[PDB]
Amino acid sequence: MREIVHIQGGQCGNQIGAKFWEVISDEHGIDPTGTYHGDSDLQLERINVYYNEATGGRYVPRAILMDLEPGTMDSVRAGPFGQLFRPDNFVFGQTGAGNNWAKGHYTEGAELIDSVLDVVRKEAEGCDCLQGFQITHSLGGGTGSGMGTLLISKVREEYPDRIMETFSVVPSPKVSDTVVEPYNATLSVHQLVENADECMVIDNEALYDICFRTLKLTTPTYGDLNHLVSAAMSGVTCCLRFPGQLNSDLRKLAVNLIPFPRLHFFMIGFAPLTSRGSQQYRALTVPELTQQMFDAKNMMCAADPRHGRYLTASALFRGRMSTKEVDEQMLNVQNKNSSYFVEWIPNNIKSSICDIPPKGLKMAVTFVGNSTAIQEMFKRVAEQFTAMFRRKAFLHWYTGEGMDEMEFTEAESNMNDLVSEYQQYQDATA
Amino acid sequence: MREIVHIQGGQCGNQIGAKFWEVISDEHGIDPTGTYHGDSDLQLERINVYYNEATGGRYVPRAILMDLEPGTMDSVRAGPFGQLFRPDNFVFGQTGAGNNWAKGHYTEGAELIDSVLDVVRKEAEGCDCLQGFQITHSLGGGTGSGMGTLLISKVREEYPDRIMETFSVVPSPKVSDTVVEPYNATLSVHQLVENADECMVIDNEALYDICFRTLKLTTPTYGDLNHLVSAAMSGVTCCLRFPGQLNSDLRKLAVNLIPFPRLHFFMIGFAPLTSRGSQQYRALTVPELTQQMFDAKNMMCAADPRHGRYLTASALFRGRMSTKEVDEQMLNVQNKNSSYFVEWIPNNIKSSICDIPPKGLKMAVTFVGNSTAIQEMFKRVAEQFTAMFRRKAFLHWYTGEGMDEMEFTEAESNMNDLVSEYQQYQDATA
Amino acid sequence: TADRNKQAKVFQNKELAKTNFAGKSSPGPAYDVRDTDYFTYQKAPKWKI
Amino acid sequence: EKEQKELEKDILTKAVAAYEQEVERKKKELYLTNKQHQSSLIGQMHDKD
Amino acid sequence: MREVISIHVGQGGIQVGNACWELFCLEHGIQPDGQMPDDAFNTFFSETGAGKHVPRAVFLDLEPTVIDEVRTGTYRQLFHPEQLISGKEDAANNFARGHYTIGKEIVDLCLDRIRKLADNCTGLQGFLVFNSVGGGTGSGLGSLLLERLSVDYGKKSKLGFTIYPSPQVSTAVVEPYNSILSTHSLLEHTDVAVMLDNEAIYDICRRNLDIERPTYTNLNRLIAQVISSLTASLRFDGALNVDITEFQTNLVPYPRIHFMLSSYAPIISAEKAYHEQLSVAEITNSAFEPANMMAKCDPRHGKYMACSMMYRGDVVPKDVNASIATIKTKRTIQFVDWCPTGFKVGINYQPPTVVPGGDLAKVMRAVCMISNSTAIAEVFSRLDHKFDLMYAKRAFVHWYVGEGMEEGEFSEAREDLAALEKDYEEVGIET
Amino acid sequence: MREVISIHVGQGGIQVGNACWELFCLEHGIQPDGQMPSDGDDAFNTFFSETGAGKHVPRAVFLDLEPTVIDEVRTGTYRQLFHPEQLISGKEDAANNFARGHYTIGKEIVDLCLDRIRKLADNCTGLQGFLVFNSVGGGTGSGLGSLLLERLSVDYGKKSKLGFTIYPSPQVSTAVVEPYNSILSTHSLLEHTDVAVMLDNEAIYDICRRNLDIERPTYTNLNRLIAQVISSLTASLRFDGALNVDITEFQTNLVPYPRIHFMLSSYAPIISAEKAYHEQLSVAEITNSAFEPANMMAKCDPRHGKYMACSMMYRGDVVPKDVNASIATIKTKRTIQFVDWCPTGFKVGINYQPPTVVPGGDLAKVMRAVCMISNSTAIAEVFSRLDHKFDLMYAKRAFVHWYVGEGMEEGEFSEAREDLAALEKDYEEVGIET
Amino acid sequence: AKTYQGKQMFPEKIKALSKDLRAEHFKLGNDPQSYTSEAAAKFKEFD
Numbered sequence A, B: 001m002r003e004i005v006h007i008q009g010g011q012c013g014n015q016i017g018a019k020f021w022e023v024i025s026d027e028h029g030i031d032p033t034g035t036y037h038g039d040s041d042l043q044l045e046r047i048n049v050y051y052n053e054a055t056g057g058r059y060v061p062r063a064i065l066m067d068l069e070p071g072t073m074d075s076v077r078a079g080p081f082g083q084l085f086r087p088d089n090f091v092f093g094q095t096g097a098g099n100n101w102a103k104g105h106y107t108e109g110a111e112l113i114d115s116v117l118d119v120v121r122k123e124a125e126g127c128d129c130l131q132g133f134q135i136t137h138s139l140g141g142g143t144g145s146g147m148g149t150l151l152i153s154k155v156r157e158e159y160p161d162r163i164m165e166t167f168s169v170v171p172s173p174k175v176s177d178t179v180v181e182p183y184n185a186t187l188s189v190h191q192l193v194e195n196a197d198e199c200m201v202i203d204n205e206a207l208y209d210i211c212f213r214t215l216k217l218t219t220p221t222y223g224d225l226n227h228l229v230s231a232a233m234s235g236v237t238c239c240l241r242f243p244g245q246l247n248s249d250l251r252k253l254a255v256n257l258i259p260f261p262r263l264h265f266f267m268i269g270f271a272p273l274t275s276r277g278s279q280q281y282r283a284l285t286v287p288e289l290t291q292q293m294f295d296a297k298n299m300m301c302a303a304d305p306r307h308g309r310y311l312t313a314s315a316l317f318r319g320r321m322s323t324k325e326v327d328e329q330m331l332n333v334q335n336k337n338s339s340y341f342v343e344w345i346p347n348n349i350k351s352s353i354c355d356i357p358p359k360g361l362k363m364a365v366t367f368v369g370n371s372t373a374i375q376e377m378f379k380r381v382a383e384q385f386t387a388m389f390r391r392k393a394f395l396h397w398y399t400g401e402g403m404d405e406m407e408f409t410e411a412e413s414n415m416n417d418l419v420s421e422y423q424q425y426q427d428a429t430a
Numbered sequence C: 001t002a003d004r005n006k007q008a009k010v011f012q013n014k015e016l017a018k019t020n021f022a023g024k025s026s027p028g029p030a031y032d033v034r035d036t037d038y039f040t041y042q043k044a045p046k047w048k049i
Numbered sequence D: 001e002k003e004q005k006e007l008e009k010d011i012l013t014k015a016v017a018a019y020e021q022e023v024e025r026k027k028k029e030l031y032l033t034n035k036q037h038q039s040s041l042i043g044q045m046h047d048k049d
Numbered sequence E: 001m002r003e004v005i006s007i008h009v010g011q012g013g014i015q016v017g018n019a020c021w022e023l024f025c026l027e028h029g030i031q032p033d034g035q036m037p038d039d040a041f042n043t044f045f046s047e048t049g050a051g052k053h054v055p056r057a058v059f060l061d062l063e064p065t066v067i068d069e070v071r072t073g074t075y076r077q078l079f080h081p082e083q084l085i086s087g088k089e090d091a092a093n094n095f096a097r098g099h100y101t102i103g104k105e106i107v108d109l110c111l112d113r114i115r116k117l118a119d120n121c122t123g124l125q126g127f128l129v130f131n132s133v134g135g136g137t138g139s140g141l142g143s144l145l146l147e148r149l150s151v152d153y154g155k156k157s158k159l160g161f162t163i164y165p166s167p168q169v170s171t172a173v174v175e176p177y178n179s180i181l182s183t184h185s186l187l188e189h190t191d192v193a194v195m196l197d198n199e200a201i202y203d204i205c206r207r208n209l210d211i212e213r214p215t216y217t218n219l220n221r222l223i224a225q226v227i228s229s230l231t232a233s234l235r236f237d238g239a240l241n242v243d244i245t246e247f248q249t250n251l252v253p254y255p256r257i258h259f260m261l262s263s264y265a266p267i268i269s270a271e272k273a274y275h276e277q278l279s280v281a282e283i284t285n286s287a288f289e290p291a292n293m294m295a296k297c298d299p300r301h302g303k304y305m306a307c308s309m310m311y312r313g314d315v316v317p318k319d320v321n322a323s324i325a326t327i328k329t330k331r332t333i334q335f336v337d338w339c340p341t342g343f344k345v346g347i348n349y350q351p352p353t354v355v356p357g358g359d360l361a362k363v364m365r366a367v368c369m370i371s372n373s374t375a376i377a378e379v380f381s382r383l384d385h386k387f388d389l390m391y392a393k394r395a396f397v398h399w400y401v402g403e404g405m406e407e408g409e410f411s412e413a414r415e416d417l418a419a420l421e422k423d424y425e426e427v428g429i430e431t
Numbered sequence F: 001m002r003e004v005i006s007i008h009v010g011q012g013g014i015q016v017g018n019a020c021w022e023l024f025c026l027e028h029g030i031q032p033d034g035q036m037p038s039d040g041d042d043a044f045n046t047f048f049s050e051t052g053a054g055k056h057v058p059r060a061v062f063l064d065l066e067p068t069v070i071d072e073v074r075t076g077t078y079r080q081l082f083h084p085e086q087l088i089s090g091k092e093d094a095a096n097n098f099a100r101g102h103y104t105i106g107k108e109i110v111d112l113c114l115d116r117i118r119k120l121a122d123n124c125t126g127l128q129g130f131l132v133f134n135s136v137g138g139g140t141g142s143g144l145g146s147l148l149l150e151r152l153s154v155d156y157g158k159k160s161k162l163g164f165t166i167y168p169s170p171q172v173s174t175a176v177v178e179p180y181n182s183i184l185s186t187h188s189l190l191e192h193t194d195v196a197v198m199l200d201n202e203a204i205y206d207i208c209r210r211n212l213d214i215e216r217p218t219y220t221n222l223n224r225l226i227a228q229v230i231s232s233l234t235a236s237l238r239f240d241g242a243l244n245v246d247i248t249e250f251q252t253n254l255v256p257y258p259r260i261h262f263m264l265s266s267y268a269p270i271i272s273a274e275k276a277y278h279e280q281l282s283v284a285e286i287t288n289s290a291f292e293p294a295n296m297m298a299k300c301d302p303r304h305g306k307y308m309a310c311s312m313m314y315r316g317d318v319v320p321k322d323v324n325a326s327i328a329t330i331k332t333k334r335t336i337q338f339v340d341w342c343p344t345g346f347k348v349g350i351n352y353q354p355p356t357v358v359p360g361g362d363l364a365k366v367m368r369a370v371c372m373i374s375n376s377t378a379i380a381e382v383f384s385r386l387d388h389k390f391d392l393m394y395a396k397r398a399f400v401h402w403y404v405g406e407g408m409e410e411g412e413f414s415e416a417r418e419d420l421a422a423l424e425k426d427y428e429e430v431g432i433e434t
Numbered sequence G: 001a002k003t004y005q006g007k008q009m010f011p012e013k014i015k016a017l018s019k020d021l022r023a024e025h026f027k028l029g030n031d032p033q034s035y036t037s038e039a040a041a042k043f044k045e046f047d
């Protein structure tokens, strides 16, 4: 009940969903043929949140996959658990955006998005009582970074009260794969800040320090990345799907996290992460877990959180625990690190408890932190974007189909204003 | 509770710890895989002093192994009981210092100390009620002598009230292996005198002499020297882990052994030591224990205690014995050698008894003596230092990365001042 | 008090291979090795009329 | 309580033991791949001369 | 649904097309007869309905010799017999002949064949064009075909793989003239141009492959390998795919600047190939080192603008990223100030194939590089100097005048080259 | 993860590099073809690189302008060992002309050599340093050595470079022009090498005659001895020991001032199999033989001057107590005296891997050995005699035109002789007491 | 070529010596010891 529809676009988002659906199917005990084979009765009480029921006793995900090139869709269909997806929900173009934000937002998007809007409207009206929408996409690619944002605007214009969640992958300068990343990144953030209720930033480089340092595995892969990110996204809504000591849903997090409407950009983290070779030495305890998600290393973002101060924090625990040492550690860490915590909002940590752990683990935690450190990504993006724009390099591609440099100037000014307004509260005093 | 954390740096300290941990593990009945197999219940109540409990029912030593050359601990891992050590506690560089105090204290060490400080903060911060820290290091080597004392100072600012003990191996000119030992020894002791609460001096020459004369074994080895220092270390903190007639911990030792705050350079001895050929003829009695206590050759320092006067003495006895002949023999020894005891501190011997002996020996002794005899070590090392320095020999290596001769002059001046102040009390009369 | 950079210095095992054979890279492509086959083979004749 | 505590040991040991074989087999198979590949250049040498 | 059409003109174009078509068929397992003994060939071929396959290529030439040798070669049954346009009279290195007299009667038939090919086509990504520039036929027919296609199709992408005259090695004595004329023609009409002068390839095959006696066939084999590494991503699945449309969004900062130089690695004989690990760091360092550039140019005299690299095989993205970090740390390679990161990277799973009886050895890891750098001005400068030397005394000009094009056209080509040089100089300075 | 790169230039350098590469492959068990036989790791990574499957590639470069020796190597039994194109050869030899090897033809080989150096150094991560081998009495050797040292000093900076140079004997000589290029080369390397060792031939001849009982020695035996010295020095890097010593731990202990970095070595025991088992070869006896002046690897008498430092590497099953006891006796002996400001002057290293024997060689199985490297004030005598010989020649300006006509300017000899005088004054002022 | 041939030549010793260097070589006294508290022997249950 209080269910959420899943929608994804772009290659990165499609790969993300390909593992998110697989992991959630494992959690609920669903085989690749869509027939239930679980053991606990709790696994089927709340199956309606993500699954619709069809004749013959099978389930289908309520996912909408959108893309501009059918190659990725054809590759993901043949993969494991690729048969769960309804063939109708697939929507794809025949040309592609070519990493051009103007192309993926203006010239063909208006023509293509009517069908996907119709199908998502059908899905939204079908469900009992809609809770919100969640989207996964990357800001470095044209088709994703444009289509996702335009769809966000359209969906918000239709459902002003429903909740909005986005998993946005941002391009860091250390691992850069396409030269035109700053342009569409700035253009996308301009639109995204205007409508998204929650955005969580994800960086490959942060993922990558995590995978080399904690797991200590020799050969990382995109599959391992998708696994980490999927576990992180499953943890946020596990408590919505399963009983717990202290239930807390997306609206709870929304009210408890954002002091002001425009500060809705977070970084997330998952725990515990250990190398398989050291799995036996480590002891799973609440203090160890809390130091573990509060480590700057495990953070999913390139920002260094000790360069600023936390606006607020939230932790979701999975497994059978008592609230005692949990709240005790929260108070303890807030006392110990008072310098990194802003003072005019006392007791700025949220705790949520869910009694069921993930399969294969006894304890798990997902941490969401709103801290002042996010400004550094936008700063570096601003420097790169202005270094590009001052020489007017790579501009005629964007200008050739209706977009003009006035929009780029407005996007840069708005993002810089966001940075300034965001750092304003960092040094604010009571 | 009131537990202590072990930290060692340099290959010499690593070798010292490799035997200290084996002897303590044998004392507490812990197998190399860390599973308890003891016989009596007395072996488990106070295991929290040096070990942490982990999942899988095993114990991990609370030691931090830090260095700049990977080979030494890559070797110690392959040794017996090398599996107890947690992998994450190994921190080391890739370059090394090459026996250069300045390189180990300014250039590489200043950058590297971040992680080792983080992990030390980890372990000291996780302990329930911290008692203090103990370090083991040699002062003949540049990297050890520099980075060890740097971290000593850094820990000192953050934990001023805790107890600090250092186990310092100082160069003896009779058996020397390096030509740059006086420079780094002086530069290091300059900071050590200002920060270390306790410093026990150990002398390879004296250990070789002990192995030659007392044990009468043909070929002493580094293992032999390590075992001697290991037994000496164990005897100090045995009473902290085992019940006894008179409990006596590190704070009590510090209160009763140091008359003035700058006088914290002690010499320690262990008893009984005999050739295993002579084991049958030995009669384990308290008078024999005391006569082997106060023997000049039993001391593991080349300084002759009969060249000066004892300031304070302290005795720790292990095994079941009655206080009668303990105090009586102590008083008799004090009266018999009155001229070697400075007069204005009557009754200048502390005694402590614990009824659990070391493995193998029915009764055992640890002795700590504060005397004026240590001045000769500083005098001879200062003579070597000035012989080196008057010709500016071996100097541009130290000057090539920021250190000037002003620090050298200040260090030698401070050493001479401390020597003068130390021998001032030798002739003091009331 | 540790940041993301400057923390990768610590050695763990032999996976430093993927990250540090180019620490001191000994410059690079600064040297000219155009048409240096002059030594391997034999040079063609060059005669006056 | 002490029973599940003692029970966890063998799960952990068997898991790490299984992971060691996974480590070893990967190296073993890559050795064979490089071996056959190098031996293929032997036929290439014969073809060329 | 993904396909691309190949155009070959001139003897050089035909001898490169033949080489690339042996490699194409051997890579896709199609026999010389065209009969196969799921759908990856649809990029380059089309199913006949039952049995064989036909290439999506067209061959043009005015001298019948090379078309005749193709039609009598082992590949008689492969090509569509009416798609091999053969002429009667060669233009004989005369650009004017091929651009004003005999190209007019060619162009209508050629466009008819292209239209017939395009009607079968449905998801046309673009065109590849192959033409030697030092020949009158190649230059003139290339000018005419690009001129007509630009207006007939418009926004469809076209890639030109031209073989420029070497700085000091050349076969003819009039090639600077038609070379400059073709540059003026293609500057405002070709989306992407790749430099392929012969001297650098001679140096490469001499140094690395260790053959003291190669000919044009080896050069064509190398060019075919480069094209295959370029277009693998359109027909093979990879962890990170790239399309031909993803070049004019990554490699051309301004519409005027679209000339790039290529490189390939590793190039090594079988006598010393696997006797070294040939790992990613070594191959990508050999790629950026100045010797393995397919063009006779030194990157050290200029800045880099944009580098696009495609890897094929079992390469690991972490390998390539570790190499890129070290390269950016490197000092001798310096990028322009207005581009902090200029690397585009693509990865494919399918390893390169080997042509039987060839020279190259097979390896798992291969890299093909397209670089746009400011150093390309030197070849234009030297060609301009050579052109001015011979135009100072109006040498050979009467042959071109007597074909019907006016006297003045050389002046506009000269001015356009001057403008190109000035534009490169201006973009090369830091702000 | 520790590596070191070896350079061989000149005919003597090549003939000693091949000699040491036989011994090193012999010690690591690698077959001459390079393939691992039959079927403890990373003991070859110090000098070798794995190809991914099978054999190993040495980390050495061979340079020559006269390609006879290189052709012999490429047709020899080690044809499959070396990389086919790191054995770099020119076309015309320098013909004992330093100007030829420093200004005329070496400039066209140095670029390719440095490219090869890059292609080898990029494959290493913990590069400990460089070893260079070259005879000083040869034109191409001295010239290319000077050029490489100059280029590497500016291209790399702070890396350690060790020169195993072979000075001409005081009275036994092969050529007549070698003093000139010797003085020029020592001038070049004084401000460019961190450590240089003496390897003149007459001392090795005398050692072979006295102990090995070889009345007719040749270059092969000398090269084997030098290779054994190299192996003794470098065993600490690739074998575990109680007191390990690294390459970087030399310039911090053995060179009291930057200008003084010339040292001379000895090895013990030197003995034949038919008499080796006749005696116990105790540590005290071998360490006395090490300080025996007649066993100096360079014919320079230590009794004529003071010592600054001595670094001694023991290999076998010696014990640190025994080493310390022997050092005590050496200190007690009066015929050897140290400089006043150096009370303690010994650096000690110990390693367990016993020396390997080359079958068909001259050495035998001895379970203990020690190699010493000493810096002492006595080395100034060879410089004095070399300066006198150079002055005798430059009095009449003989042979000068052969260097002048190669583009090397006339005044070059002047500052070379001046720097030799300055070094002699430096040694004189160091040798005095305070 | 006369001197330089491919020859047949063929770690346990190293490991043995390394463990010998770390070995005890003198052990300690022989064990008669059984753990017992000091204040437990004196204070016992009485009938």
Ligand SMILES: Nc1nc2c(ncn2[C@@H]2O[C@H](COP(=O)(O)OP(=O)(O)OP(=O)(O)O)[C@@H](O)[C@H]2O)c(=O)[nH]1
Binding pocket: E009, E010, E011, E012, E013, E015, E016, E063, E090, E091, E092, E093, E094, E132, E133, E134, E135, E136, E137, E138, E139, E163, E170, E171, E172, E175, E198, E216, E219, E220
């Ligand atoms: N790399 C390479 N270059 C070629 C080849 N064939 C011709 N060329 C070059 O082309 C230049 C002259 O143009 P060609 O291709 O030979 O002749 P064409 O293009 O048919 O023009 P016409 O001679 O007038 O028929 C020569 O200078 C060659 O360098 C080839 O097969 N490979």
Ligand SMILES: Nc1nc2c(ncn2[C@@H]2O[C@H](COP(=O)(O)OP(=O)(O)OP(=O)(O)O)[C@@H](O)[C@H]2O)c(=O)[nH]1
Binding pocket: F009, F010, F011, F012, F013, F015, F066, F093, F094, F095, F096, F097, F135, F136, F137, F138, F139, F140, F141, F142, F166, F168, F174, F175, F178, F201, F219, F222, F223
């Ligand atoms: N110890 C030793 N010295 C050698 C050997 N071969 C040559 N020399 C010395 O090298 C000096 C001359 O240089 P060479 O090694 O013969 O040849 P080079 O160094 O390449 O110089 P060029 O002869 O000009 O090519 C002579 O004075 C010899 O003393 C050798 O095998 N062993």
Ligand SMILES: Nc1nc2c(ncn2[C@@H]2O[C@H](COP(=O)(O)OP(=O)(O)O)[C@@H](O)[C@H]2O)c(=O)[nH]1
Binding pocket: A009, A010, A011, A012, A015, A016, A099, A138, A140, A141, A142, A143, A144, A145, A176, A177, A178, A204, A222, A223, A225, A226
């Ligand atoms: N974590 C993760 N990142 C990916 C994956 N696939 C691509 N990326 C990243 O996405 C970026 C390119 O995005 P792109 O494919 O252009 O997005 P699109 O245009 O919307 O399809 C690259 O920098 C990759 O690092 C994936 O499977 N997982």
Ligand SMILES: Nc1nc2c(ncn2[C@@H]2O[C@H](COP(=O)(O)OP(=O)(O)O)[C@@H](O)[C@H]2O)c(=O)[nH]1
Binding pocket: B009, B010, B011, B012, B015, B016, B099, B138, B140, B141, B142, B143, B144, B145, B177, B178, B204, B222, B223, B225, B226
């Ligand atoms: N007791 C003992 N002393 C050792 C051992 N290893 C080294 N030493 C001492 O350490 C001193 C040399 O220290 P050094 O190597 O310079 O320290 P570093 O700077 O950390 O490398 C020598 O005088 C030895 O007496 C050992 O295993 N046991």
Ligand SMILES: [Mg+2]
Binding pocket: E010, E011, E135, E137
């Ligand atoms: Mg032609």
Ligand SMILES: [Mg+2]
Binding pocket: F010, F011, F138, F140
């Ligand atoms: Mg020679």
